[PDB]
Structure formats: C-alpha cells, structure tokens
C-alpha cells in the first residue's frame, strides 16, 4: 500500500522553507569532488570536468571526471560478478532498499536534494520539489509496490503439477543514460532496473551531476550493495561505444535526444552477433507539444496553464507546450492576457529570490541553441516576436520567456523541439477548427503531450478521437506538463520514444525476463497414448 | 465530466479439454472422416487482401511430409506490389478497428475458439496431420487445444487489462486508453505449430492492430483453415491480410514501409537478427519505433540426478526427444545421466526405442511419430547422422537410418557422446536425434555448470531428482539456462495459462505468449487526464 508523496507549500516560516534555505546556504560557494564509483571504490581519471550553476556559471558546483573505456569495462565486470546474488534476493528485500531511500528523501534528505537540484540544474523551489522530492520518491515507492505485487501474478496449477513464475532480472548489465532536466528520471532509469534484480552502469548527466550523486549516495546508504549500480559519468559517444561493444549488454534505459537513441539502436543492431541475448532498448525521446484551444475554453485557465507549461523550468521539459492553437474569436483576449502576464514574470536567481518564476537555461550549448531559434524568429517572414526575445549569458545562461506568433502552421518553429522558454502561437479561423485539429495531428513527428481546452462536451469527444495518436499524455482543461506517478503514467509514441510508461504498473516488465517453473509431483506414465492401442 | 468511461467486464475461461480419441468415439470418427476428406485432395489457397482472393505467378506447393507425392495445397507468393497494397488497405481499416471496444474485438476470437473446439476441430486436426505430418495427439494439443487456449486466454487478458487504471485525485479524472500500435504489424509464423500462426497474427489483431500474416509454406493448409475461421467468426476485412510470400521478399517489403510498427516472429535466429538489422537500417523512415518480438530455437536439456525416478526419466525423455520427430523448439536433444543410473537408463531407453513405431499418422494411429517436415530438414538431419557415424567422440546406440523414397522418414536416433562440448551437443538439429552424456556422480555440480554454459540457448530444460536440496540447488544454478524449467516432467508441452512459454539468451526476446503480459507488447497506452475545475494563477503561494 503506497500513496503519493505530498507536495509541500513552502510557506513563510514553514519547517520545509527554513530547511531549504539552510540547505541552499550549505551549497553557496561549494564545489563537490564527485568521483566515479565502481563497487565501493572512488576512482579518478585525468579527464576532469566541471558542473556549473546555470544562473551563476562562475560557481563550479562540482568537479567530476569521465570514465574511460578501461574503467567502464572494469565496471561492467564488477557489476556482472554481483548480479547473480542480487537477482536471487527476494523481491521484497530489494524493494526495501528503495522504500528506505524514499523515506530518506521524504524527510532528512529532502532539503539537500532540492537544493542540489536548484543550484546545479537551475530549478526554482517548486520545480525541485515536484522533481527531486515528490517524483523520485513516488518512483521508488510505486515501483516497489508494482514489483512486489507482480510476484503475485502467477499461473494456473492443475494437479498433479505446480506452476510458478520467477521474475528474473535480465542476464547481463543494463546501461542507464539520464538527462539533465529531472533529477527523478536518473533515479528511475538506474533504480527501476536495479529493483528488478539487474545490475546497472549509470551515466548521469554532466549538468545534473551534483543532485545525481546525491541520489546515488542515498541509495547506497539505504542498503544498496556494492556493484549493483556503478556511478560512471562519461563522454556520451565513449559510453555508448563501450556498452554496445560488450557481449554482456542486456538493456539500455535511455532518456534524451531522438538522434542519440537512434544511434544506440543502430549500434546494438550492428553488434547483434556479439551479445549473449537480445538487448532491450527503452527510450524517452521528447516532443513538440500542443495546447489546442476551442472557442468555448475558459480563457483564464488557457492563460495560466499555457504560461506554466511553456515557461516553467525555462521550457526545458519533454512535455512543455511550445505550440498554441487559438481561434480568432479568442485571440484578442488571449494575446492581451499573455502579454500582460509575461511582463510580470520574474527571471532570476532561484536560490536568492523565491519570487523567481524560472531561471537560466542549463548550459552554454543550450543557450546557443535557443538563441539560434530567437534569431530565426527575428528572420522568418511568417514569425513575429510579440514579447521577450532577449538573452544574456554574462552571469548565467539567461533567456527571457518569448512569445511568438506564426502565420504558418507548419513553420519549422512549429515542428522542431527547442527545449527553451519559447512559445509559438498559431491563430486559426473559428469555422476551421476541424481542419486545424487535423493540422495539430499531422504537423510534427512527435506524440508526447497535448492539451485541449474546451467546455463543450461534443467538441471534447471529437477532439479526443482525432488526437488519439498525437499525444500519449493527453489533457482536457489542464496543462501539458506535470505528470504524476501512478496518476498519469508518462510517455508517447511516434518519434517520442518506445512508450514504456514509467509511472505506471507495466514499466517494470521491461526489466524482467520471466522463467516459469513446472514441478510435477507424481511419476510419469508410459510414453505411449491410449488412442494408439 | 465530459469524458464518460464505461465500467469494464470480466471473462471466465478455462483450458480446452484434450480429447481421448478412443475407439468408437465421436471425435475419432469425426477425425477419420476429416482425414478421408483430404485424401487425394489439393486445395488452391489464394492470397487474401480485404475480401479479395488474389493469385500471382509464383505458384508453390505444400507436400504431405509422409507422402510427398501428395500435394496438399497449391498456393502463391504475394509479390511486392500485392504486399504494399495489403499494407495500404490494412492501414485504411486500422482506425475503425482500433476504436472498436476491446470486448467486441475479443468476441471474434471467442467465436473462433468455439468453432475450433466443436464443428471445425476435425478439419484443423486433419489438415495439421496431413500437411505437417502430426499424429492425432500432436495435432490435438496444437491446432485445437493450444490455439483455442490462445484465443480464449488472450481475450480474457485483454478485456481485463482495461480494468488496470491509474489513481484519480481531485480535481481530475485519469484514464488509460489501450491503443493499438499506429501502423501495421507483420506476423511471420513457423511450420511446426498451427497454433503459433494463429497467435502471432491474432494477438496483435485483438489489441486493435492490423496485420500482414505470412504463414509458413509447410503449414499452409492448416493456416488458411484458421484464417477462414477467423473471418467467419466476424473478423472484418483488412484486419489480417493472408499473404504467403518469399521470406526475404516479405521482410524487405515490410521493413521498407514507413508504417511498420511491429514484427511478431517465430523462426530461426539468423532470420530474426536479419529483420532486426533491416529495421535499424530504416529507422529514419518509420513514423515510430517498431517493436520486434522473436521466438527462436533451443538446444534443450534433461538433467538427471542419481535420485531420479528412472521410469519417469525414460518416459519423459522419449516423448520430449521424439514426439513430432523432435521438431519442437522445446524438444530435449541433450540428456545428462549420472554413471550410477546409466546401466538402468540405457537398458530401458534401448528397449523402449525398439517399440517406437514410425509411419503414416493418418493411416495408422499406432504411429508414435511420422516423417520430418520437408526435403531441407531431411537433408540436414541426414548430415548429422553421418556426423555421428564419423565422429570419434560419438557412438550411435539406436536408430540412425533414414529413407526419403515415400516420405521424409527418419528413425528415432540415440547417440552417446564422450565429449560434453561436441558440436552435436551445441547445435539445434530439429530432428529425432537425442545425444546422451554420462557424468560421474561426484561431479554433478561441475556438470550442472556445463549444462548452463555449453550452448547459446536458454529455452527449456528439466531436472529429474527426488532430493529436495538437489532440486533447489539445480533450480538456482540453471536459472538462466531455461525460460521454461521442469522438475520431474518433460521439457515439452507448455500449456497456455499454465506454462507461459519462452526463453532468453539466443532463444529470443521472451515475451511469454501463453501468459498475461504478452498482449502488452501490442498496445501503446495513452493516458487522458480531465480536469474539472478552472486552473488558478500561474504563480505559486511560496513566491509571494
């Protein structure tokens, strides 16, 4: 029996707000030296790297290093040697490690992981809370529940035989490759397979190293044995090349770009004759998510839900709204309100100013990519910047929220994932709402999240049918971000990935390869059959 | 609430009872009639796209394995044009089929299951016997029982899956929609089980997919029979396209389509790997990432401990190794026996061997097993028998002869190897060829390690022992050597809902058809959240 972790309010004078402020002060001016961890060994290579605070890049929040091919190969060997015993452990015993970790994250370690996510990844208080605390805690508690309950899914036994399913971990090691934008995803990508009796090489994101290592240490402290999860930061291509070259690879649990996932998929395919078994690839690959508005919509909900979806955490979510479809009849209201609220958004230091709505984007490369899109918006004949458009990387990687109108529903900016605070609006004629729904479905290569805002039941039913494959997480009168474990299992198809729905009950099935054992309790008869006589 | 979700139902099903076919029984008379109905007959089996029967110039024949002069079916290979037309038409039918309630789709399969159970039982058994060379009881466990069980149990699993729903908290309602995959699925089925073709095409269809089904050439007669029953049970046009084809041609075409969303495959490891590689080559062309499911071969073991019941070892091993001529991915091909029990076991095996009758399964119900499937299989097995004769490490204990003048007939053959790593202990033969290795009792632990490490496969295996500690030890040691592991029973004959079937290592992706989770591979869920109250401000209270 598990329920969702409460989201704290962080009111003035509250225990959690005081605790968080202390944790933030604990990180001010600090650099943690974070080693690779193989078993219990802390290992340093000469390939030194730094994680910078996105809103103050002079602050090196961590120094770490890239594992080389040799170190990665040692990590593989060490993990494989620990796998059999771990896999033989009762599911309940493995679950206990994650349940203990969840309690630590909920209580004594909450402030630490929130603060490290804020300072290291640039999240505001609430974005860190829903991620590093609530989502991570929920992943650990719900997956533990799902896994313990899965053992109860057993086949039919008929006398004189007894049948039993053993939920084996996969034979080999799993490579877990996590993204910068959610601390919780790292914990799940490495943790879910480990829960199911796998051993894991975890390559955490360079730009989330501080919080990722915090989670790692908590798992170890909660009782995770050595060599079950190896903590191995590495150059992306080097890590991919190394794990896909190992005969013992049995899975890749990936969250990141489509091209990188496709590359790994192709590397595994090139090497099929080397592997002991067919590796399982799981990929969560982003989107180009929509909010579609019908003329019956509640304007205030459209405005607030769209501002949040598009701009929270600087739009750096695979689920963020980046294309808004508005009927002509409502445009003067929605335009006016978006622009007015836009001027009230505070972009700044989220540790020093809790008034901040969102902060700097993650790193120099993200800043550069997003700037290219703002430059495009200034160039394109079909695009007009209505608000925002500024950026400044002198102190932090700061990009202002930007609202653009496109006259072309199929402009590249309507199609390509930017991962920045950049919202494009297309205004459609009221009487062409159906043709426009078709455009929502056909315009992009993605299928992740989408929302419809409408107060007309027939419209909602029609839109729901038409957009069936345009979004794997579909929202009626709510924003396209903020899936909650156990409530909105998350994922989509088309180019958005393999859709294994982490956050729901079936995800863990990807990380078990069941064995069925039949025991017969009476001696066998003759080999002949009666009809043969 | 603007979206209304209907309550979900449940379904009660049980395994299809195996019939006895005793003398004078209605089922025995019915089967004999159905067999006579096929004597001297050749069915012309077209490709079917929608409701159109299509012929191409690439005419092919299916032969009766025990009487290859008998062409049981004339069929044709779909060309690339027809395959692509089949894809287009399937795609145009998909949205409607996907939107149909799960319960309505399930009803087609429940109707088909009942037809197979009753009025069509004799037909599908007879066609499996005559076309694939099965004996009465092998046809019965396959074309009737397993296929019927697949249809009924998958229907239950699918209807009940819709009841697995997420938590809702005010002010919102959450619902999971179990969407079929967007695109088409290619189903590629093997000669050796009629039921497998039905499941490979049928399970994805049940889940709201559309399918191009390429049946096995050497099982065409029974396969088309199943296809027709599905259509008669109410399967709409263009949901399953019946498209026999050249294997490479079929794979090239389906892997070249932007709309491929899955391959459901049972067959050889190299072919599965090839398809996997073709999909990887075409990744940038697809609308979504295709899901590949592969059930491949085995090199399966029976391991005997000194505490084993000798008669159970002999009975279960003869059946596992030799039923259907050992042409099962699950068949025992390696037997490990302790020195202490070898005199008893060898004596019994050799005696019982001499009592095994090989012959025409239609004309003589006394037949234990019949001819192997085709000329290619016969040639391969012949080469292995020749290897047994020439290899210094091998000794033929019984059988060893073969004759293809009338049917593809091979004697059951028992070989002893002095080398536990001989090639014959490693490579899948798919013929009635059992190899025995005798180990010293005091080396049982080391030998268990060999059982685990000797082959590339991980499909089925059995341990015969009455010592509980030994059973526990072996169970732990062999955990990954068999996806279907048996204690004091034979390594073949998994039953739907009782022993979900499949294994890893080189044996495939292990999606466990026969169990409750298999259908999850053929759905891509969507979660809908409906919020029933206006949203608040975009700011949060803590920002004040």
From Swiss-Prot, chain B:
**Binding site residues for NAD(+):** 189, 214, 267-271, 428
The record's subcellular location field reads:
Mitochondrion matrix
Name the positions where substrate binds: 494
Q: Could you tell me which residues carry Phosphoserine?
A: 25
Q: Name the predominant localization.
A: mitochondrion
Q: What name appears for this protein in its UniProt entry? A: Delta-1-pyrroline-5-carboxylate dehydrogenase, mitochondrial
GO cellular component term of the entry, any? cytosol
Q: Name one GO biological process term.
A: proline catabolic process to glutamate
This protein's encoding gene: Aldh4a1
Q: How does it assemble?
A: Homodimer.
The record describes its post-translational modification as: Acetylation of Lys-80, Lys-95 and Lys-383 is observed in liver mitochondria from fasted mice but not from fed mice.
Q: Which residues form the active site?
A: 295 (proton acceptor), 329 (nucleophile)
One MF term from GO for this chain?
1-pyrroline-5-carboxylate dehydrogenase activity
- Which reactions does this protein catalyse? L-glutamate 5-semialdehyde + NAD(+) + H2O = L-glutamate + NADH + 2 H(+)
Q: What is its EC number?
A: 1.2.1.88
Q: Which InterPro entries is this protein grouped with?
A: Ald_DH/histidinol_DH (IPR016161), Ald_DH_C (IPR016163), Ald_DH_CS_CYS (IPR016160), Ald_DH_CS_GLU (IPR029510), Ald_DH_N (IPR016162), Aldehyde_DH_dom (IPR015590), P5CDH/ALDH4A1 (IPR005931)
**Lineage of the source organism?**
Eukaryota, Metazoa, Chordata, Craniata, Vertebrata
Q: According to UniProt, where does the site described as Transition state stabilizer lie?
A: 192
Naturally occurring in which organism (per UniProt): Mus musculus (Mouse)
What family, per the record? Belongs to the aldehyde dehydrogenase family.
Please list the residues that carry the modification N6-acetyllysine. Answer: 33, 74, 80, 95, 111, 156, 299, 339, 346, 357, 443, 490, 512, 533
Source domain of life: Eukaryota
| Residues the record lists as N6-succinyllysine modifications | 12, 74, 80, 95, 111, 156, 328, 339, 376, 490
């Amino acid at each position: 029996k598990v329920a969702n972790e409460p989201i704290l309010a962080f009111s003035q004078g509250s225990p959690e707000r005081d605790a968080l402020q202390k944790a933030l002060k604990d990180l001010k001016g600090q650099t943690e030296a974070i080693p690779c961890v193989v078993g219990d060994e802390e290992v340093w290579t000469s390939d030194i790297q730094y994680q910078l605070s996105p809103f103050n890049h002079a602050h090196k929040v961590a120094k770490f290093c890239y594992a080389d091919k040799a170190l990665l190969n040692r990590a593989i060997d060490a993990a494989l040697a620990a796998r059999k015993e771990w896999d033989l452990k009762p599911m309940a015993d493995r679950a206990q490690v994650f349940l203990k970790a969840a309690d630590m994250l909920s209580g004594p370690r909450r402030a630490e992981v929130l603060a490290k996510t804020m300072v290291g990844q640039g999240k505001t208080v609430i974005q860190a809370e829903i991620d590093a605390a609530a989502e991570l805690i929920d992943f650990f508690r719900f997956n533990a529940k799902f896994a313990v309950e899965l053992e109860g899914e057993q086949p039919i036994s008929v006398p004189p035989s007894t049948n039993h399913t053993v939920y084996r971990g996969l034979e080999g090691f799993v490579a877990a490759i996590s993204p910068f934008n959610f601390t919780a995803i790292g914990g799940n990508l490495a943790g879910a397979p480990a829960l199911m009796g796998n051993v894991v090489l975890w390559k955490p994101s360079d730009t989330a190293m501080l919080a990722s290592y915090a989670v790692y240490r908590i798992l170890r402290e909660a009782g995770l044995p050595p060599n079950i999860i190896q903590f191995v930061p590495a150059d992306g291509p080097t890590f991919g090349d190394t794990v896909t070259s190992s005969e013992h690879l049995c899975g890749i649990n990936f969250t990141g770009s489509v091209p990188t996932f496709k590359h790994l998929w192709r590397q595994v395919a090139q090497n099929l004759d080397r592997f002991r078994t067919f590796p399982r690839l799981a990929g969560e690959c982003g989107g180009k998510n929509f909010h579609f508005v019908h003329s019956s919509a509640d304007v205030d909900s459209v405005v607030s839900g769209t501002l949040r979806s598009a701009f929270e955490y600087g739009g750096q979510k695979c689920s963020a709204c980046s294309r808004l479809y508005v009927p002509k009849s409502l445009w003067p209201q929605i335009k006016g309100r978006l622009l007015e609220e836009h001027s009230r958004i505070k972009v700044g230091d989220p540790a020093e100013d809790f008034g901040t709505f969102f902060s700097a984007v993650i790193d120099a490369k993200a800043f550069a990519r997003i700037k290219k899109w703002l430059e495009h918006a200034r160039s394109s004949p079909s695009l007009s910047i209505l608000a925002g458009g500024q950026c400044n990387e002198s102190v932090g990687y700061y990009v202002e929220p930007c609202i653009i109108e496109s006259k072309d529903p199929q402009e590249p900016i309507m199609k390509e994932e930017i991962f920045g605070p950049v919202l494009t609006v297309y205004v459609y004629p009221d009487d062409k709402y159906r043709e426009t729904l078709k455009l929502v479905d056909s315009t992009t290569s993605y299928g992740l999240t989408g929302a419809v805002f409408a107060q007309d039941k027939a419209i909602v039913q029609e839109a729901t049918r038409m957009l069936r494959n345009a979004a794997g997480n579909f929202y009626i009168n709510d924003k396209s971000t903020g899936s909650v474990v156990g409530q909105q299992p998350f994922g989509g198809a088309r180019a958005s990935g393999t859709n294994d729905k982490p956050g729901g009950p079936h995800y863990i099935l990807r990380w078990t390869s069941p064995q069925v054992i039949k025991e017969t309790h009476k001696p066998l008869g003759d080999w002949r059959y009666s009809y043969m006589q």
